[PDB]
Design a protein around this ligand. Structure first.
Ligand SMILES: [Cl-]
Ligand SMILES: [Hg+2]
Length: 384
């Protein structure tokens, strides 16, 4: 009932990179130097908005965000005052780097000068401010804001949509700058450290980023205003991201397998996240990566193997009869692909009942989600 223990993930530090595979990663050094540069720029910028002695404004709004940035409303809705205001809110909360934080309703107030971009604790009473997820692609962050911005733009007059376009381009420049030298993407950028520095597939983070750049490269969904020079970069970026997905797929000696929520930017092997999230193949995140690859027009054999492989392991590992409909363990043992679970105490188990109910509840360790990649593979194998 207790497989092993969960070790912490490894931050992408200069020492991990100092192991230069012969002037091969002078790229990663530059990458970190830019990350650090931007980070300071971010903090100094917010600080510059406050006046000496001026009390901190209250923390910004928090809660479900994506639902305040609907991307499927009718065209007309994007010309309304309601949509224009969501855009203004969006434009006001973009970080100097060009990104956005998560869990922030954008239908309320505009960010006040000196007010945090994403969120912080109330400064109870009786410049060192909180800095977590200040530019993330988790929970659909950044990607959603850029898509919304583009919808509004596409339904307004060119002469009346400069701010939204400009914030959109900053957002696209943000996603381009944060991409790893090997095409992957970190959950937070500028780099915050820890498992946040891992190539993040978790919550569709990387897939969403790649689909966004793909669309930009194509000039669709309202990105027709994007300069060709930048659309070319988004294309190259999307190709790099696809490659990454390919060079990261877990190969069980000969066979191909799933992917797992996060991978080390240098090791490429599945790494860990939180105390209760050990390095391990992920059913749900694999199904998403698969659905994404099956979307590719004229896949290379490399991409063809990846799809066929992942889809297979998704079938070698299923569930008889949380029962009636096909099942999958959120996580599967890299060694010996079998259901795996964990707890807030770094201990890896092989039974949900061997976990604190606090973790046994809320968090979902089993799921039917993967099925989506199966029905998809069917029609996909044909034209390939
Ligand atoms: Cl087409
Ligand atoms: Hg990669």
């Amino acid at each position: 009932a207790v497989i092993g223990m969960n070790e912490a993930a490894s931050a992408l530090t200069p020492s991990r990179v100092s192991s230069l595979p012969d002037t091969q990663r002078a790229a990663w050094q530059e990458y970190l130097a830019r990350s650090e540069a931007q980070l300071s720029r971010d903090k100094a910028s917010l600080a510059a908005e406050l006046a000496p002695g001026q009390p901190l404004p209250p923390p910004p709004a928090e809660g479900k965000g994506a639902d305040t940035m609907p991307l499927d409303k009718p065209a007309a809705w994007y010309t309304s005052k309601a949509a224009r205001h969501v855009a203004d809110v969006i434009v006001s909360f973009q970080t100097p780097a060009g990104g956005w934080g998560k869990n922030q309703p954008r239908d309320g107030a505009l960010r006040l000068p000196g007010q945090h971009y994403t969120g912080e604790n109330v400064a109870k009473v009786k410049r060192d401010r909180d800095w977590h997820y200040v530019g993330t692609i988790d929970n659909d962050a950044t990607v959603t804001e850029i898509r919304f911005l583009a919808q509004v733009v596409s339904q307004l007059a060119p002469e009346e949509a400069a701010p939204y376009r400009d914030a959109a381009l900053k957002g696209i420049e943000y996603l381009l700058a944060s991409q790893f030298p090997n095409g992957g993407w970190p959950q937070v950028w500028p780099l915050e450290g820890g498992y946040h520095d891992a190539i993040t597939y978790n919550d569709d983070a990387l897939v969403h980023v790649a689909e966004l750049l793909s669309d930009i490269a194509a000039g669709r969904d309202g990105f027709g205003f994007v300069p060709p020079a930048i659309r070319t970069r988004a294309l190259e970026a999307t190709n790099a991201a696809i490659h990454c997905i390919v060079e990261t797929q877990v190969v069980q000696d000969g066979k191909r397998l799933g992917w797992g929520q996060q991978h080390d930017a240098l090791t490429l092997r599945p790494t860990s996240a939180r105390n209760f999230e050990p390095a391990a193949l992920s059913s749900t995140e694999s199904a998403r990566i698969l659905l994404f690859l099956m979307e590719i027009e004229a896949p290379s054999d490399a991409v063809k193997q990846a799809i066929r492989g992942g889809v297979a392991w998704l079938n070698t590992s299923v569930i008889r009869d949380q029962g009636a409909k096909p099942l999958w363990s959120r996580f599967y043992s890299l060694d010996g692909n079998k259901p795996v679970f964990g707890d807030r105490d770094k201990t890896i188990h092989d039974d949900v009942m061997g976990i604190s109910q606090e973790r046994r509840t809320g968090y979902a360790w089993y799921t039917t989600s993967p099925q989506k990649a199966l029905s998809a593979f069917t029609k996909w194998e044909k034209r390939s």
